[PDB]
Design a protein around this ligand. Sequence first.
Ligand SMILES: [Cl-]
Length: 30
Amino acid sequence: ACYCRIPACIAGERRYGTCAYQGRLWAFCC
Ligand SMILES: [Cl-]
């Protein structure tokens, strides 16, 4: 499933773009 993550996606995931939410930027990870 896909999550917004701070600070980075973990192994086994890949990053597919970015979230801006609550004044922070997040990796969008799947
Ligand atoms: Cl980040």
